[PDB]
Amino acid sequence: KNFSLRIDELEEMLTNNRIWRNRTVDIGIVTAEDALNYGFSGVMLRGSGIQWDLRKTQPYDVYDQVEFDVPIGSRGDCYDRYLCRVEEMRQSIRIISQCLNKMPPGEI
Amino acid sequence: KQDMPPVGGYGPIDYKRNLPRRGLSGYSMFAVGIGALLFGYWSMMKWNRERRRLQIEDFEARIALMP
C-alpha cells in the first residue's frame, strides 16, 4: 500500500526529464521480422510491436483468474521498451492486491 | 487451523500515475522575466549617471590645481 509513491518518484526522475530522454531516443531501432527471426522473447518484443506473451495465452496455475493488462510501447527503440517496465510494475501491485482476497485455507 | 487469509481490511494502493502540480504556465511565464529585467535597467541611469556626476567631480580637482 506504500509502493506506488516510490514508483511515482522515478517518474519525476526520468520520464519528464529531457536529457535522459535525449540520452535514449531512436537508439536500437530493431522492429522488422528479423526482430522475431532472431528469436527474441518479451520486452524487446511486444513493447516493440507484435502483441504476444506467455502470461494469458498459456496458463501456469491459478493465474488466469486475475485481471491485468500488458503494456505496449509505440516504436521499436529502447525508450519504447523502457516504458514497458514502468507499467509492468504498475501491474504487479494490482495482482498482489487481487491475489490476497482469494486464498483459501488448506494443505501444503 | 491457524492459517492466514484475513476476513477484511484492504485498499488497494493505486496503479494511477499523475502529479500535475502546475505551476504558472501559459504566458504567465515570460512576464516575470521581462519586467524584472527592465527593473534592473531601471536601476541603471540613476547610478551610472550619478557616478558620471562624481566622475566630473573627480576630474574637477585635477584641473583646478596644476598651475
Swiss-Prot record, chain A:
It comes from the Eukaryota. [4Fe-4S] cluster binds at C78, C84, C99. It is found in: Mitochondrion inner membrane. Core subunit of respiratory chain NADH dehydrogenase (Complex I) which is composed of 45 different subunits. Component of the iron-sulfur (IP) fragment of the enzyme. Interacts with NDUFAF3. Interacts with NDUFAF7. Interacts with CERS2. Core subunit of the mitochondrial membrane respiratory chain NADH dehydrogenase (Complex I) which catalyzes electron transfer from NADH through the respiratory chain, using ubiquinone as an electron acceptor. Essential for the catalytic activity and assembly of complex I. Redox-sensitive, critical component of the oxygen-sensing pathway in the pulmonary vasculature which plays a key role in acute pulmonary oxygen-sensing and hypoxic pulmonary vasoconstriction. Plays an important role in carotid body sensing of hypoxia. Belongs to the complex I 49 kDa subunit family. This is NADH dehydrogenase [ubiquinone] iron-sulfur protein 2, mitochondrial. The lineage of its organism: Eukaryota, Metazoa, Chordata, Craniata, Vertebrata. The gene is NDUFS2. The chain holds residues 249 to 356 of 463 of the full protein.
Swiss-Prot record, chain B:
GO terms for molecular function: NADH dehydrogenase (ubiquinone) activity. It is found in: Mitochondrion inner membrane; Nucleus. The keyword Electron transport applies. GO terms for cellular component: cytoplasm; mitochondrial inner membrane; mitochondrion; nucleoplasm; respiratory chain complex I. Its main location: mitochondrion. The chain crosses the membrane at residues 24-45. It comes from the Eukaryota. Keywords: Acetylation, Apoptosis, Electron transport, Membrane, Mitochondrion, Mitochondrion inner membrane, Nucleus, Respiratory chain, Transmembrane, Transmembrane helix, Transport. GO terms for biological process: apoptotic process; negative regulation of DNA-templated transcription. Belongs to the complex I NDUFA13 subunit family. Accessory subunit of the mitochondrial membrane respiratory chain NADH dehydrogenase (Complex I), that is believed not to be involved in catalysis. Complex I functions in the transfer of electrons from NADH to the respiratory chain. The immediate electron acceptor for the enzyme is believed to be ubiquinone. Involved in the interferon/all-trans-retinoic acid (IFN/RA) induced cell death. This apoptotic activity is inhibited by interaction with viral IRF1. Prevents the transactivation of STAT3 target genes. Complex I is composed of 45 different subunits. Interacts with CARD15, but not with CARD4. Interacts with STAT3, but not with STAT1, STAT2 and STAT5A. Interacts with OLFM4. This is NADH dehydrogenase [ubiquinone] 1 alpha subcomplex subunit 13. It comes from Bos taurus (Bovine).
